[PDB]
């Protein structure tokens, strides 16, 4: 339907918000996307540790989950993600397993279990020839 896409087809759009105004990010929808996975039974916390003040991200009127990033910026939630944040056991993400045992992981171990995407190229569609017959 759309324009010619050499890589993949995009039948559904991600519905990107406009960048004329500042943008709220509502995370109350996140929990069931987080509750989905097999080993996860629930989540215990959802907050930010005072790293929003550099661009004055204000939480909107009453709800704890939403935050509004100021005009130009876009979220980068964990920059240089596993080695900087997730593996180091500083706790940006604290896993609690069997009451309290609270196990952790390194950087390279989760990349093997990470889904690796595939670069796909879309060749043009043609009808190949049949056998030429001497009707002449």
């Amino acid at each position: 339907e759309g324009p010619l896409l050499e890589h993949g087809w995009i039948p559904e759009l991600p519905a990107a918000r406009d960048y004329t105004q500042r943008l709220t990010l509502n995370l109350s929808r996140l929990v069931n996307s987080l509750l989905e996975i097999e080993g996860i039974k629930h989540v215990n916390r959802l907050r930010l540790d005072d790293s929003f003040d550099k661009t004055a991200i204000e939480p909107v009127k009453g709800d704890t989950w939403s935050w509004s990033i100021k005009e130009g910026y876009y979220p980068r939630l964990w920059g240089e993600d596993p080695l900087n944040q997730l593996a180091q056991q500083n706790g940006p993400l604290r896993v609690i397993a069997k009451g309290g045992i609270s196990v952790s992981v390194s950087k390279e171990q989760i990349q093997a279990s990470l889904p690796s995407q595939s670069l796909i190229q879309n060749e043009p569609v043609i009808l190949a020839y049949g056998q030429h017959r001497d009707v002449g």
Binding site: N26, S28, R29, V31, N32, H42, L46, T64, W65, S66
Partner: protein, 602 residues
């Protein structure tokens, strides 16, 4: 997996979930790939695994062709289609090997351990049998058969009476009571009157309730100090008016030689010890309790009771209507607060009635035992009795259970080998109450912190929470048993337990945790319809005992703040919530011991 044999094989053996070989066909070809890469294809660096998987064929693709995830193309390499033909043969020794641990278990229970399986349980039904106008008396023995229709794929369902009643023409014309709510003023209700043709209304009347058909007894609004005016007519002499609610039954077209047999359909919270009185020609009530042989346990449960109507009981009498014979019933309701301490609920009452049990239990297929048989079904007997006019069932088919399936028979014997009919531990007390009693929804243990602080606490208190099918107190969200049958559950479990274990069951007090949430909905819905609809499923999940016909699902005392917040999000009409504001009478609230949480939305 080989659907040609495994239909024949699964029908003979139970074939449980566990398999001795979880070896899938994709899992097998990776095992044969690591095997063939050792075997040397001669005088070459390449091995035999390059032969068996030659041209664009990986073992993940060959498993796709075998399981037919890919349509089978006409050209496959012959040494590969030789290999896929072998795995089609090897489904046969594997499928006979998976069927063996199901047969090893059944050999253990039946051959060595000697255990049997439960047979089908016949269900009985309330049956009211009215006569014609042509005769007065008609006798029918034990073992006459009534029926309605036929079971699917099998025989007809017959019902037989257990005791030989004799029928008489007559009915329950009048049911009225006096109740004593206040001093010096008493009210006179008339729910059932055949002479004004008004019926027993709305399927069930609260006995001694606010009917608004009452008229105050103005002869007794001041106590007498007229011909001695009392309720329902003039009395000959002084008669006491005691603080006891009592109901009067009006019998019609019955001769004093004949007997009367009622079936009461009752849900009573507590049993009232009743005494029965009948009219006389001297206008004095006499005791009837020698003649009553009741199985309703003084109006506790539903049951039949037959009374030969006593000799010298008089149709014509003072202080009562003259047309009908009358029976008095004095109810001693036990003193208790709330709607628990009130009267029975009285779904209905039928005359000339006697129960009827199922005749042949082995011939009937399992489809009939799944549901209770429907109401107003049996309308005729098997053998045509010509003087009979009609039979009818107003209610139908309590009790009766399925013949045991091999899945549920294994769960039954796995319980008997775990606790062995002694309630010695906390877990054994939880299941042993749950299998025997059908009124129990769940039992929850008394917590984690309680068993570790323990400065010599002998007394243990199991907190039972019942279903909405069997609750005596009139509260849908808070179901309570009466303490007499609640004490009887302790007396059953005292035998199984240690003699030093003083064990008693109670209902837990209900903590109310309130929430005040704001939530933005779909663009094209009104929020008041959206608030009410979302509240019902939220009331259902965290109070599963409240909604009728629910299987008992095990659920913890703790409610999580985020698992609550996610459960709101899975409704189809929700879009986004703002805040929850958990308000215990914002974090996750955990239930203190002997307490159960109930959500409140205002």
């Amino acid at each position: 997996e080989l659907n040609e044999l495994t239909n024949k094989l699964s029908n003979l053996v139970p074939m449980t979930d566990f398999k001795l070989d979880n070896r899938a066909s994709l899992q097998l070809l990776k095992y044969i790939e690591a095997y063939t890469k050792i075997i040397p294809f001669n005088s070459g660096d390449k091995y035999w695994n390059d032969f068996f998987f030659m041209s664009g064929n990986t073992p993940e693709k060959l498993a796709k062709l075998y399981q037919k995830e890919i349509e089978p193309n006409g050209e496959l390499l012959p040494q590969q289609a030789f290999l896929l033909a072998v795995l089609r043969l090897l489904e046969t020794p594997i499928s006979l090997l998976n069927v063996l641990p199901a047969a090893h278990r059944e050999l253990y229970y039946r051959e060595l351990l000697g255990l049997s399986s439960h047979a089908a349980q016949p269900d009985q039904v309330a049956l009211s049998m009215e006569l014609n106008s042509t005769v007065m008396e008609q006798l029918l023995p034990e073992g006459t058969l009534f029926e309605a229709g036929q079971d699917e794929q099998g025989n007809a369902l017959q019902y037989a009476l257990d005791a030989s009643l004799l029928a008489n023409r007559g009915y329950i014309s009048d049911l009225r009571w006096l109740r004593n709510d206040g001093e010096k003023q008493w009210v006179t209700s008339a729910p059932w009157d055949l002479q004004a043709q008004v019926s027993l209304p709305s399927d069930g009347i609260r006995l001694f309730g606010k009917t608004n058909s009452d008229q105050q007894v103005f002869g007794g609004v001041l106590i007498t100090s007229m011909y001695h005016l009392t309720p329902f007519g003039y009395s000959s002499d002084i008669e006491p008016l005691e603080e006891n609610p009592a109901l009067y039954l009006g019998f019609t077209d019955v001769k004093p030689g004949q007997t009367l047999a009622l079936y009461w359909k009752l849900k009573s919270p507590q049993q009232p010890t009743v005494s029965w009185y009948y009219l006389d020609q001297h206008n004095q009530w006499a005791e009837l309790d020698s003649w009553v042989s009741d199985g309703t346990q003084n109006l506790y449960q539903d049951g039949t009771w037959h009374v030969e109507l006593p000799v010298d009981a008089s149709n014509q009498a003072e202080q009562m209507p003259v047309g009908r014979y009358w029976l008095r019933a004095v109810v001693e309701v036990p003193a208790h607060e709330g709607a628990l301490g009130k009267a029975p609920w009285l779904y209905g009452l039928i005359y000339n009635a006697m129960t009827a049990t199922l005749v042949n239990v082995d011939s009937i297929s399992d489809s009939h035992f799944l549901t209770p048989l429907p109401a107003s079904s049996i309308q005729r007997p098997v053998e045509p009795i010509i003087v009979l006019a009609s039979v009818n069932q107003p209610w139908a088919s309590w009790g009766g259970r399925i013949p045991e399936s091999y899945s549920a028979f294994f769960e039954r014997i796995a319980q008997n080998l775990s606790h062995r009919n002694r309630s010695l531990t906390w877990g054994n007390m939880v299941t042993l109450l749950k299998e025997r009693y059908v009124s129990i929804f769940d039992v929850k243990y008394p917590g984690n912190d309680e068993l570790t602080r323990v400065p010599a606490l002998e007394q243990q208190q199991l907190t039972v929470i019942p279903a909405n099918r069997y609750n005596d107190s009139d509260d849908s969200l808070r179901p309570v048993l009466n303490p007499a049958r609640l004490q009887e559950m302790a007396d059953w479990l005292q035998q199984k337990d240690s003699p030093w274990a003083s064990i008693e069951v109670r209902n837990p007090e209900y903590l109310d945790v309130k929430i005040h949430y704001e939530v933005i909905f779909k663009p094209d819905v009104n929020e008041d319809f959206g608030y009410r609809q979302l509240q019902q499923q939220l009331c259902e999940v965290y109070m599963p005992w409240s909604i009728d016909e629910q299987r008992p699902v095990v659920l913890n005392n703790s409610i999580n703040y985020f698992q609550l917040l996610a459960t709101i999000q899975q409704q189809p009409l929700v879009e986004r919530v703002t805040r929850l504001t958990l308000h215990r009478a914002t974090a996750s609230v955990e239930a203190k011991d002997n307490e159960v949480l109930i959500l409140v939305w205002e």
